[PDB]
Structure formats: structure tokens, C-alpha cells
mmCIF file with all atom_site columns, C-alpha atoms and ligand atoms in Angstrom:
data_model
loop_
_atom_site.group_PDB
_atom_site.id
_atom_site.type_symbol
_atom_site.label_atom_id
_atom_site.label_alt_id
_atom_site.label_comp_id
_atom_site.label_asym_id
_atom_site.label_entity_id
_atom_site.label_seq_id
_atom_site.pdbx_PDB_ins_code
_atom_site.Cartn_x
_atom_site.Cartn_y
_atom_site.Cartn_z
_atom_site.occupancy
_atom_site.B_iso_or_equiv
_atom_site.pdbx_formal_charge
_atom_site.auth_seq_id
_atom_site.auth_comp_id
_atom_site.auth_asym_id
_atom_site.auth_atom_id
_atom_site.pdbx_PDB_model_num
ATOM   1   C CA  . UNK A 1 1   ? -4.407  -13.452 -1.549  1.00 9.75  ? 1   UNK A CA  1
ATOM   2   C CA  . UNK A 1 2   ? -7.499  -14.846 0.165   1.00 10.63 ? 2   UNK A CA  1
ATOM   3   C CA  . UNK A 1 3   ? -7.124  -12.525 3.166   1.00 10.11 ? 3   UNK A CA  1
ATOM   4   C CA  . UNK A 1 4   ? -6.753  -9.537  0.831   1.00 6.77  ? 4   UNK A CA  1
ATOM   5   C CA  . UNK A 1 5   ? -9.910  -10.411 -1.116  1.00 8.39  ? 5   UNK A CA  1
ATOM   6   C CA  . UNK A 1 6   ? -11.820 -10.564 2.181   1.00 7.16  ? 6   UNK A CA  1
ATOM   7   C CA  . UNK A 1 7   ? -10.511 -7.066  2.944   1.00 10.72 ? 7   UNK A CA  1
ATOM   8   C CA  . UNK A 1 8   ? -11.762 -5.644  -0.349  1.00 11.26 ? 8   UNK A CA  1
ATOM   9   C CA  . UNK A 1 9   ? -15.111 -7.421  0.070   1.00 11.83 ? 9   UNK A CA  1
ATOM   10  C CA  . UNK A 1 10  ? -15.572 -5.729  3.456   1.00 10.51 ? 10  UNK A CA  1
ATOM   11  C CA  . UNK A 1 11  ? -14.732 -2.392  1.833   1.00 9.04  ? 11  UNK A CA  1
ATOM   12  C CA  . UNK A 1 12  ? -17.394 -3.021  -0.845  1.00 8.92  ? 12  UNK A CA  1
ATOM   13  C CA  . UNK A 1 13  ? -20.032 -3.867  1.770   1.00 9.75  ? 13  UNK A CA  1
ATOM   14  C CA  . UNK A 1 14  ? -19.179 -0.627  3.588   1.00 9.32  ? 14  UNK A CA  1
ATOM   15  C CA  . UNK A 1 15  ? -19.282 1.490   0.418   1.00 10.40 ? 15  UNK A CA  1
ATOM   16  C CA  . UNK A 1 16  ? -22.626 -0.025  -0.656  1.00 13.72 ? 16  UNK A CA  1
ATOM   17  C CA  . UNK A 1 17  ? -24.127 0.882   2.720   1.00 13.92 ? 17  UNK A CA  1
ATOM   18  C CA  . UNK A 1 18  ? -22.796 4.462   2.619   1.00 13.84 ? 18  UNK A CA  1
ATOM   19  C CA  . UNK A 1 19  ? -23.961 5.021   -0.974  1.00 11.99 ? 19  UNK A CA  1
ATOM   20  C CA  . UNK A 1 20  ? -27.421 3.604   -0.198  1.00 11.43 ? 20  UNK A CA  1
ATOM   21  C CA  . UNK A 1 21  ? -27.799 6.047   2.692   1.00 10.69 ? 21  UNK A CA  1
ATOM   22  C CA  . UNK A 1 22  ? -26.908 8.909   0.340   1.00 9.84  ? 22  UNK A CA  1
ATOM   23  C CA  . UNK A 1 23  ? -29.202 7.681   -2.457  1.00 8.54  ? 23  UNK A CA  1
ATOM   24  C CA  . UNK A 1 24  ? -32.337 7.489   -0.274  1.00 10.56 ? 24  UNK A CA  1
ATOM   25  C CA  . UNK A 1 25  ? -31.820 10.998  1.130   1.00 12.02 ? 25  UNK A CA  1
ATOM   26  C CA  . UNK A 1 26  ? -34.410 13.304  -0.454  1.00 7.49  ? 26  UNK A CA  1
ATOM   27  C CA  . UNK A 1 27  ? -31.864 16.136  -0.737  1.00 8.44  ? 27  UNK A CA  1
ATOM   28  C CA  . UNK A 1 28  ? -29.698 14.085  -3.120  1.00 8.17  ? 28  UNK A CA  1
ATOM   29  C CA  . UNK A 1 29  ? -32.322 12.820  -5.588  1.00 8.76  ? 29  UNK A CA  1
ATOM   30  C CA  . UNK A 1 30  ? -30.859 15.086  -8.291  1.00 7.86  ? 30  UNK A CA  1
ATOM   31  C CA  . UNK A 1 31  ? -27.606 13.070  -8.003  1.00 7.31  ? 31  UNK A CA  1
ATOM   32  C CA  . UNK A 1 32  ? -29.126 9.564   -8.091  1.00 10.47 ? 32  UNK A CA  1
ATOM   33  C CA  . UNK A 1 33  ? -29.270 9.064   -11.889 1.00 11.16 ? 33  UNK A CA  1
ATOM   34  C CA  . UNK A 1 34  ? -27.147 10.178  -14.865 1.00 11.56 ? 34  UNK A CA  1
ATOM   35  C CA  . UNK A 1 35  ? -28.089 13.339  -16.709 1.00 13.90 ? 35  UNK A CA  1
ATOM   36  C CA  . UNK A 1 36  ? -29.893 12.504  -19.941 1.00 14.47 ? 36  UNK A CA  1
ATOM   37  C CA  . UNK A 1 37  ? -27.874 14.204  -22.729 1.00 13.04 ? 37  UNK A CA  1
ATOM   38  C CA  . UNK A 1 38  ? -31.017 14.243  -24.899 1.00 12.64 ? 38  UNK A CA  1
ATOM   39  C CA  . UNK A 1 39  ? -33.109 16.120  -22.329 1.00 13.60 ? 39  UNK A CA  1
ATOM   40  C CA  . UNK A 1 40  ? -30.207 18.353  -21.201 1.00 8.52  ? 40  UNK A CA  1
ATOM   41  C CA  . UNK A 1 41  ? -28.261 19.145  -24.386 1.00 11.02 ? 41  UNK A CA  1
ATOM   42  C CA  . UNK A 1 42  ? -25.904 21.681  -22.792 1.00 6.69  ? 42  UNK A CA  1
ATOM   43  C CA  . UNK A 1 43  ? -24.675 19.357  -20.021 1.00 5.30  ? 43  UNK A CA  1
ATOM   44  C CA  . UNK A 1 44  ? -21.897 17.734  -22.088 1.00 9.01  ? 44  UNK A CA  1
ATOM   45  C CA  . UNK A 1 45  ? -20.716 21.229  -23.064 1.00 5.49  ? 45  UNK A CA  1
ATOM   46  C CA  . UNK A 1 46  ? -19.822 21.818  -19.417 1.00 3.53  ? 46  UNK A CA  1
ATOM   47  C CA  . UNK A 1 47  ? -19.219 18.327  -17.961 1.00 2.48  ? 47  UNK A CA  1
ATOM   48  C CA  . UNK A 1 48  ? -16.798 15.901  -19.621 1.00 2.00  ? 48  UNK A CA  1
ATOM   49  C CA  . UNK A 1 49  ? -16.699 13.270  -16.833 1.00 2.00  ? 49  UNK A CA  1
ATOM   50  C CA  . UNK A 1 50  ? -20.255 12.681  -15.597 1.00 2.00  ? 50  UNK A CA  1
ATOM   51  C CA  . UNK A 1 51  ? -20.828 10.891  -12.311 1.00 2.00  ? 51  UNK A CA  1
ATOM   52  C CA  . UNK A 1 52  ? -23.872 9.990   -10.211 1.00 2.00  ? 52  UNK A CA  1
ATOM   53  C CA  . UNK A 1 53  ? -24.788 7.704   -7.341  1.00 2.00  ? 53  UNK A CA  1
ATOM   54  C CA  . UNK A 1 54  ? -26.134 4.930   -9.592  1.00 2.00  ? 54  UNK A CA  1
ATOM   55  C CA  . UNK A 1 55  ? -22.822 4.891   -11.451 1.00 2.00  ? 55  UNK A CA  1
ATOM   56  C CA  . UNK A 1 56  ? -20.970 4.741   -8.121  1.00 2.00  ? 56  UNK A CA  1
ATOM   57  C CA  . UNK A 1 57  ? -23.026 1.638   -7.209  1.00 2.00  ? 57  UNK A CA  1
ATOM   58  C CA  . UNK A 1 58  ? -22.100 0.048   -10.560 1.00 2.00  ? 58  UNK A CA  1
ATOM   59  C CA  . UNK A 1 59  ? -18.400 0.733   -9.979  1.00 2.00  ? 59  UNK A CA  1
ATOM   60  C CA  . UNK A 1 60  ? -18.526 -0.832  -6.490  1.00 2.00  ? 60  UNK A CA  1
ATOM   61  C CA  . UNK A 1 61  ? -19.973 -4.033  -7.967  1.00 2.00  ? 61  UNK A CA  1
ATOM   62  C CA  . UNK A 1 62  ? -17.350 -4.026  -10.762 1.00 2.00  ? 62  UNK A CA  1
ATOM   63  C CA  . UNK A 1 63  ? -14.611 -3.896  -8.066  1.00 2.00  ? 63  UNK A CA  1
ATOM   64  C CA  . UNK A 1 64  ? -13.340 -0.492  -9.246  1.00 2.00  ? 64  UNK A CA  1
ATOM   65  C CA  . UNK A 1 65  ? -12.775 0.929   -5.718  1.00 2.00  ? 65  UNK A CA  1
ATOM   66  C CA  . UNK A 1 66  ? -9.869  -0.561  -3.746  1.00 2.00  ? 66  UNK A CA  1
ATOM   67  C CA  . UNK A 1 67  ? -9.707  2.239   -1.147  1.00 2.00  ? 67  UNK A CA  1
ATOM   68  C CA  . UNK A 1 68  ? -12.058 4.769   0.382   1.00 2.00  ? 68  UNK A CA  1
ATOM   69  C CA  . UNK A 1 69  ? -9.950  7.448   -1.330  1.00 2.00  ? 69  UNK A CA  1
ATOM   70  C CA  . UNK A 1 70  ? -10.887 6.089   -4.776  1.00 2.00  ? 70  UNK A CA  1
ATOM   71  C CA  . UNK A 1 71  ? -14.547 6.182   -3.718  1.00 2.00  ? 71  UNK A CA  1
ATOM   72  C CA  . UNK A 1 72  ? -14.295 9.708   -2.307  1.00 2.00  ? 72  UNK A CA  1
ATOM   73  C CA  . UNK A 1 73  ? -12.768 10.913  -5.568  1.00 2.00  ? 73  UNK A CA  1
ATOM   74  C CA  . UNK A 1 74  ? -16.026 10.005  -7.331  1.00 2.00  ? 74  UNK A CA  1
ATOM   75  C CA  . UNK A 1 75  ? -18.175 11.604  -4.610  1.00 2.00  ? 75  UNK A CA  1
ATOM   76  C CA  . UNK A 1 76  ? -16.031 14.725  -4.998  1.00 2.00  ? 76  UNK A CA  1
ATOM   77  C CA  . UNK A 1 77  ? -16.572 14.516  -8.775  1.00 2.00  ? 77  UNK A CA  1
ATOM   78  C CA  . UNK A 1 78  ? -20.356 14.448  -8.336  1.00 2.00  ? 78  UNK A CA  1
ATOM   79  C CA  . UNK A 1 79  ? -19.976 17.578  -6.213  1.00 2.00  ? 79  UNK A CA  1
ATOM   80  C CA  . UNK A 1 80  ? -17.512 19.433  -8.424  1.00 2.00  ? 80  UNK A CA  1
ATOM   81  C CA  . UNK A 1 81  ? -19.554 18.666  -11.559 1.00 2.00  ? 81  UNK A CA  1
ATOM   82  C CA  . UNK A 1 82  ? -22.671 20.097  -9.919  1.00 2.00  ? 82  UNK A CA  1
ATOM   83  C CA  . UNK A 1 83  ? -20.807 23.261  -8.905  1.00 2.00  ? 83  UNK A CA  1
ATOM   84  C CA  . UNK A 1 84  ? -19.501 23.738  -12.463 1.00 2.00  ? 84  UNK A CA  1
ATOM   85  C CA  . UNK A 1 85  ? -22.884 23.232  -14.128 1.00 2.00  ? 85  UNK A CA  1
ATOM   86  C CA  . UNK A 1 86  ? -24.626 25.467  -11.526 1.00 2.00  ? 86  UNK A CA  1
ATOM   87  C CA  . UNK A 1 87  ? -22.276 28.465  -11.200 1.00 2.00  ? 87  UNK A CA  1
ATOM   88  C CA  . UNK A 1 88  ? -24.794 31.339  -11.445 1.00 2.00  ? 88  UNK A CA  1
ATOM   89  C CA  . UNK A 1 89  ? -26.708 33.307  -8.821  1.00 2.00  ? 89  UNK A CA  1
ATOM   90  C CA  . UNK A 1 90  ? -30.149 32.067  -9.855  1.00 2.00  ? 90  UNK A CA  1
ATOM   91  C CA  . UNK A 1 91  ? -31.983 30.071  -7.155  1.00 2.00  ? 91  UNK A CA  1
ATOM   92  C CA  . UNK A 1 92  ? -32.056 26.801  -9.109  1.00 2.00  ? 92  UNK A CA  1
ATOM   93  C CA  . UNK A 1 93  ? -28.263 26.881  -9.308  1.00 2.00  ? 93  UNK A CA  1
ATOM   94  C CA  . UNK A 1 94  ? -27.905 27.877  -5.654  1.00 2.00  ? 94  UNK A CA  1
ATOM   95  C CA  . UNK A 1 95  ? -30.195 25.054  -4.543  1.00 2.00  ? 95  UNK A CA  1
ATOM   96  C CA  . UNK A 1 96  ? -28.213 22.396  -6.433  1.00 2.00  ? 96  UNK A CA  1
ATOM   97  C CA  . UNK A 1 97  ? -24.893 23.794  -5.135  1.00 2.00  ? 97  UNK A CA  1
ATOM   98  C CA  . UNK A 1 98  ? -26.178 23.631  -1.554  1.00 2.00  ? 98  UNK A CA  1
ATOM   99  C CA  . UNK A 1 99  ? -27.247 20.003  -2.060  1.00 2.00  ? 99  UNK A CA  1
ATOM   100 C CA  . UNK A 1 100 ? -23.953 19.163  -3.775  1.00 2.00  ? 100 UNK A CA  1
ATOM   101 C CA  . UNK A 1 101 ? -21.962 20.498  -0.822  1.00 2.00  ? 101 UNK A CA  1
ATOM   102 C CA  . UNK A 1 102 ? -24.296 18.712  1.583   1.00 2.00  ? 102 UNK A CA  1
ATOM   103 C CA  . UNK A 1 103 ? -23.693 15.450  -0.307  1.00 2.00  ? 103 UNK A CA  1
ATOM   104 C CA  . UNK A 1 104 ? -19.908 15.824  -0.045  1.00 2.00  ? 104 UNK A CA  1
ATOM   105 C CA  . UNK A 1 105 ? -20.009 16.865  3.621   1.00 2.00  ? 105 UNK A CA  1
ATOM   106 C CA  . UNK A 1 106 ? -22.361 14.002  4.503   1.00 2.00  ? 106 UNK A CA  1
ATOM   107 C CA  . UNK A 1 107 ? -20.229 11.342  2.792   1.00 2.00  ? 107 UNK A CA  1
ATOM   108 C CA  . UNK A 1 108 ? -17.037 12.589  4.455   1.00 2.00  ? 108 UNK A CA  1
ATOM   109 C CA  . UNK A 1 109 ? -18.712 12.749  7.879   1.00 2.00  ? 109 UNK A CA  1
ATOM   110 C CA  . UNK A 1 110 ? -20.047 9.171   7.664   1.00 2.00  ? 110 UNK A CA  1
ATOM   111 C CA  . UNK A 1 111 ? -16.618 7.896   6.640   1.00 2.00  ? 111 UNK A CA  1
ATOM   112 C CA  . UNK A 1 112 ? -14.813 9.866   9.371   1.00 2.00  ? 112 UNK A CA  1
ATOM   113 C CA  . UNK A 1 113 ? -17.208 8.481   11.967  1.00 2.00  ? 113 UNK A CA  1
ATOM   114 C CA  . UNK A 1 114 ? -17.610 4.891   10.780  1.00 2.00  ? 114 UNK A CA  1
ATOM   115 C CA  . UNK A 1 115 ? -14.531 3.787   8.786   1.00 2.00  ? 115 UNK A CA  1
ATOM   116 C CA  . UNK A 1 116 ? -11.645 2.588   10.933  1.00 2.00  ? 116 UNK A CA  1
ATOM   117 C CA  . UNK A 1 117 ? -8.417  4.383   9.992   1.00 2.00  ? 117 UNK A CA  1
ATOM   118 C CA  . UNK A 1 118 ? -6.391  1.163   10.167  1.00 2.00  ? 118 UNK A CA  1
ATOM   119 C CA  . UNK A 1 119 ? -8.826  -0.605  7.822   1.00 2.00  ? 119 UNK A CA  1
ATOM   120 C CA  . UNK A 1 120 ? -8.369  2.146   5.234   1.00 2.00  ? 120 UNK A CA  1
ATOM   121 C CA  . UNK A 1 121 ? -4.587  2.032   5.694   1.00 2.00  ? 121 UNK A CA  1
ATOM   122 C CA  . UNK A 1 122 ? -4.651  -1.728  5.043   1.00 2.00  ? 122 UNK A CA  1
ATOM   123 C CA  . UNK A 1 123 ? -6.653  -1.184  1.840   1.00 2.00  ? 123 UNK A CA  1
ATOM   124 C CA  . UNK A 1 124 ? -4.116  1.394   0.676   1.00 2.00  ? 124 UNK A CA  1
ATOM   125 C CA  . UNK A 1 125 ? -1.114  -0.831  1.436   1.00 2.00  ? 125 UNK A CA  1
ATOM   126 C CA  . UNK A 1 126 ? -2.651  -3.706  -0.526  1.00 2.00  ? 126 UNK A CA  1
ATOM   127 C CA  . UNK A 1 127 ? -3.319  -1.304  -3.420  1.00 2.00  ? 127 UNK A CA  1
ATOM   128 C CA  . UNK A 1 128 ? 0.252   0.056   -3.382  1.00 2.00  ? 128 UNK A CA  1
ATOM   129 C CA  . UNK A 1 129 ? 1.593   -3.522  -3.589  1.00 2.00  ? 129 UNK A CA  1
ATOM   130 C CA  . UNK A 1 130 ? -0.169  -4.203  -6.906  1.00 2.00  ? 130 UNK A CA  1
HETATM 131 C C1  . G7H B 2 .   ? -26.922 17.023  -12.283 1.00 2.00  ? 201 G7H B C1  1
HETATM 132 C C2  . G7H B 2 .   ? -27.111 18.536  -12.103 1.00 2.00  ? 201 G7H B C2  1
HETATM 133 O O1  . G7H B 2 .   ? -26.176 19.187  -11.617 1.00 2.00  ? 201 G7H B O1  1
HETATM 134 C C3  . G7H B 2 .   ? -28.217 19.178  -12.563 1.00 2.00  ? 201 G7H B C3  1
HETATM 135 N N1  . G7H B 2 .   ? -28.156 20.529  -12.460 1.00 2.00  ? 201 G7H B N1  1
HETATM 136 C C4  . G7H B 2 .   ? -29.204 21.232  -12.907 1.00 2.00  ? 201 G7H B C4  1
HETATM 137 N N2  . G7H B 2 .   ? -29.219 22.574  -12.890 1.00 2.00  ? 201 G7H B N2  1
HETATM 138 C C5  . G7H B 2 .   ? -30.124 23.294  -13.601 1.00 2.00  ? 201 G7H B C5  1
HETATM 139 O O2  . G7H B 2 .   ? -31.066 22.839  -14.253 1.00 2.00  ? 201 G7H B O2  1
HETATM 140 C C6  . G7H B 2 .   ? -29.861 24.799  -13.595 1.00 2.00  ? 201 G7H B C6  1
HETATM 141 C C7  . G7H B 2 .   ? -28.579 25.033  -14.412 1.00 2.00  ? 201 G7H B C7  1
HETATM 142 N N3  . G7H B 2 .   ? -28.273 26.468  -14.526 1.00 2.00  ? 201 G7H B N3  1
HETATM 143 C C8  . G7H B 2 .   ? -29.421 27.150  -15.152 1.00 2.00  ? 201 G7H B C8  1
HETATM 144 C C9  . G7H B 2 .   ? -30.689 26.942  -14.329 1.00 2.00  ? 201 G7H B C9  1
HETATM 145 N N4  . G7H B 2 .   ? -30.990 25.499  -14.222 1.00 2.00  ? 201 G7H B N4  1
HETATM 146 S S1  . G7H B 2 .   ? -30.315 20.190  -13.534 1.00 2.00  ? 201 G7H B S1  1
HETATM 147 C C10 . G7H B 2 .   ? -29.382 18.755  -13.146 1.00 2.00  ? 201 G7H B C10 1
HETATM 148 C C11 . G7H B 2 .   ? -29.896 17.549  -13.477 1.00 2.00  ? 201 G7H B C11 1
HETATM 149 C C12 . G7H B 2 .   ? -30.012 16.448  -12.617 1.00 2.00  ? 201 G7H B C12 1
HETATM 150 C C13 . G7H B 2 .   ? -30.575 15.254  -13.059 1.00 2.00  ? 201 G7H B C13 1
HETATM 151 C C14 . G7H B 2 .   ? -31.063 15.129  -14.357 1.00 2.00  ? 201 G7H B C14 1
HETATM 152 N N5  . G7H B 2 .   ? -31.623 13.973  -14.741 1.00 2.00  ? 201 G7H B N5  1
HETATM 153 C C15 . G7H B 2 .   ? -32.141 12.991  -13.749 1.00 2.00  ? 201 G7H B C15 1
HETATM 154 C C16 . G7H B 2 .   ? -32.127 11.711  -14.549 1.00 2.00  ? 201 G7H B C16 1
HETATM 155 C C17 . G7H B 2 .   ? -32.519 12.235  -15.922 1.00 2.00  ? 201 G7H B C17 1
HETATM 156 C C18 . G7H B 2 .   ? -31.881 13.483  -15.967 1.00 2.00  ? 201 G7H B C18 1
HETATM 157 O O3  . G7H B 2 .   ? -31.604 14.045  -17.023 1.00 2.00  ? 201 G7H B O3  1
HETATM 158 C C19 . G7H B 2 .   ? -30.977 16.228  -15.211 1.00 2.00  ? 201 G7H B C19 1
HETATM 159 C C20 . G7H B 2 .   ? -30.403 17.413  -14.765 1.00 2.00  ? 201 G7H B C20 1
HETATM 160 C C1  . G7H B 2 .   ? -34.633 16.776  -17.873 1.00 2.00  ? 202 G7H B C1  1
HETATM 161 C C2  . G7H B 2 .   ? -34.280 17.144  -16.431 1.00 2.00  ? 202 G7H B C2  1
HETATM 162 O O1  . G7H B 2 .   ? -33.617 18.148  -16.186 1.00 2.00  ? 202 G7H B O1  1
HETATM 163 C C3  . G7H B 2 .   ? -34.723 16.277  -15.512 1.00 2.00  ? 202 G7H B C3  1
HETATM 164 N N1  . G7H B 2 .   ? -35.179 15.089  -15.967 1.00 2.00  ? 202 G7H B N1  1
HETATM 165 C C4  . G7H B 2 .   ? -35.614 14.238  -15.035 1.00 2.00  ? 202 G7H B C4  1
HETATM 166 N N2  . G7H B 2 .   ? -36.100 13.033  -15.368 1.00 2.00  ? 202 G7H B N2  1
HETATM 167 C C5  . G7H B 2 .   ? -36.656 12.176  -14.480 1.00 2.00  ? 202 G7H B C5  1
HETATM 168 O O2  . G7H B 2 .   ? -36.772 12.341  -13.266 1.00 2.00  ? 202 G7H B O2  1
HETATM 169 C C6  . G7H B 2 .   ? -37.161 10.883  -15.122 1.00 2.00  ? 202 G7H B C6  1
HETATM 170 S S1  . G7H B 2 .   ? -35.436 14.976  -13.548 1.00 2.00  ? 202 G7H B S1  1
HETATM 171 C C7  . G7H B 2 .   ? -34.760 16.413  -14.164 1.00 2.00  ? 202 G7H B C7  1
HETATM 172 C C8  . G7H B 2 .   ? -34.441 17.456  -13.365 1.00 2.00  ? 202 G7H B C8  1
HETATM 173 C C9  . G7H B 2 .   ? -34.780 18.764  -13.709 1.00 2.00  ? 202 G7H B C9  1
HETATM 174 C C10 . G7H B 2 .   ? -34.490 19.841  -12.880 1.00 2.00  ? 202 G7H B C10 1
HETATM 175 C C11 . G7H B 2 .   ? -33.883 19.653  -11.648 1.00 2.00  ? 202 G7H B C11 1
HETATM 176 N N3  . G7H B 2 .   ? -33.671 20.741  -10.889 1.00 2.00  ? 202 G7H B N3  1
HETATM 177 C C12 . G7H B 2 .   ? -33.375 22.090  -11.433 1.00 2.00  ? 202 G7H B C12 1
HETATM 178 C C13 . G7H B 2 .   ? -32.714 22.755  -10.252 1.00 2.00  ? 202 G7H B C13 1
HETATM 179 C C14 . G7H B 2 .   ? -33.567 22.200  -9.142  1.00 2.00  ? 202 G7H B C14 1
HETATM 180 C C15 . G7H B 2 .   ? -33.787 20.885  -9.557  1.00 2.00  ? 202 G7H B C15 1
HETATM 181 O O3  . G7H B 2 .   ? -34.055 19.977  -8.773  1.00 2.00  ? 202 G7H B O3  1
HETATM 182 C C16 . G7H B 2 .   ? -33.571 18.349  -11.270 1.00 2.00  ? 202 G7H B C16 1
HETATM 183 C C17 . G7H B 2 .   ? -33.854 17.268  -12.115 1.00 2.00  ? 202 G7H B C17 1
#
């Protein structure tokens, strides 16, 4: 309906704002662009479902997220991918893992603080009706 499309538009505006705040944070620069499979040949060996903050922005604008849970699944994928590709004790790995966990924690904290629970419930009930 028209009222439902307004609901999803508000969700998109919210998700764009959250993702922008993550993308300008200096700690998360390593997650802002896709890994180049040419420059990092072993990445596809480990990671079959790549995700990054620029791809999240593209999916918002293609109307792929109907709930905050769909969005958080891709944030969690950015994080879990980084943990899998950086599993070793060396400091480069440990630095990326720390940033990956910080990215996840920061996204969840913004949403917990700023997304109304009833708005998210509405989004979910519209989604379940389709
Ligand atoms: C995404 C991620 O998790 C990631 N992890 C890394 N870890 C390491 O290099 C660890 C791995 N263990 C051995 C020691 N070195 S590099 C890296 C990464 C991030 C971004 C790019 N970009 C930016 C755009 C062009 C491009 O290709 C490439 C790679
Ligand atoms: C090829 C590649 O790996 C790469 N290419 C880029 N291209 C551009 O920025 C254009 S950035 C980037 C890259 C390399 C290493 C990191 N790492 C290693 C762990 C600490 C850390 O930050 C992050 C990103």
C-alpha cells in the first residue's frame, strides 16, 4: 500500500544514515570497499559471500532490506567474513578482527539506541504479509 511504502522509505533513510556513520569512521575503512580478487587472490578461497559497506549502500538503494534484521544480517556477514579471513595470531589479523567486532558492536548499539522497537515490528509484519 501507500502507507507501507512510506514505512519502507523511512527504514531506508534510517539505514543510509547508520551506514554512512559507519563508513566515515576511520576504524572501518578496511570494510568500505570490496576486496579486489586480483590483488588478493586467496580471498575467494576463504570467503564465498563477500560483503562490504559500499555493497550495503547499493542494496539499500535497490530496496533489498525490508527490516533492520535483514540489514543486520549483512553487517554480521561483514564481521564474520573478516574473522574467517583473519583467524591467526599475527597482529595484522588481530587488528582486523578487533575492527570487525567494533563494527558489529557499533551498528547494534546505534540501532538499539535509535530505532524504535515498534517501527521495526511494523516492518517485520509488513514483510511477513508478502
Ligand atoms: C576485508 C579483510 O578482511 C581484509 N583482511 C585482510 N587481512 C590481511 O591482509 C591479513 C590476512 N591474514 C594474513 C595477514 N594479512 S586484508 C583485507 C582487505 C580489505 C580491503 C581490501 N581492499 C580494499 C579495496 C581494494 C581491496 O582489495 C583488501 C583486503
Ligand atoms: C590489496 C590490498 O590488500 C589492499 N588494497 C587496497 N586498495 C586501495 O585502497 C585502493 S587497500 C588494501 C589493504 C591492504 C591491507 C590492509 N590491512 C592488512 C591488515 C591491516 C590492514 O589494514 C587493508 C587494506
